[PDB]
Amino acid sequence: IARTFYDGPEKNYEKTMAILQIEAEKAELRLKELEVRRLMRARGDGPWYQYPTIDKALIDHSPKTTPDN
Amino acid sequence: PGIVELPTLEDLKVQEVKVSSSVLKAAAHHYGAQCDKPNKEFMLCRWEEKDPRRCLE
């Protein structure tokens, strides 16, 4: 029965280790992502949460019929 | 925040051109033809400094 239908314990052992490593990495990544999101929303210095500002290319840098603009 | 620096009254004293608008308009073309260099210097100062206090002379 063991030869025909089942395998050794080493296979399940090492598969369990691989699964545990994947899940632990995923958990640490989720926590890190939450912290990064909080920091980016608080500060705004990162790529995320970059709300638009007025484009400076719309400014007209020409004499304005009045020296004091 | 800060103190605005203003010229003294003696710095704003000059001989005034006290002819009316009709005299000025009658003379305007020749006046622009002849007195152009100081006028353009003053206008360049005016449009480059953006400050009346820096173009009194």
Ligand SMILES: CCCCCCCCCCCCCCCCC[C@@H](O)O[C@H](CO[C@H](O)CCCCCCCCCCCCCCC)COP(=O)(O)OCC[N+](C)(C)C
């Ligand atoms: C000498 C023996 C004397 C005593 C007899 C004891 C009787 C025991 C037989 C009863 C078997 C119970 C069913 C349990 C089947 C386990 C299914 C599965 O777990 O096994 C698969 C193995 O496949 C097997 O071939 C399963 C075949 C059994 C199919 C059962 C069907 C029986 C129904 C018969 C009904 C009658 C039909 C006629 C209708 C009129 C696993 O696939 P695989 O990942 O690859 O193999 C991994 C292990 N290896 C790598 C070491 C090989």
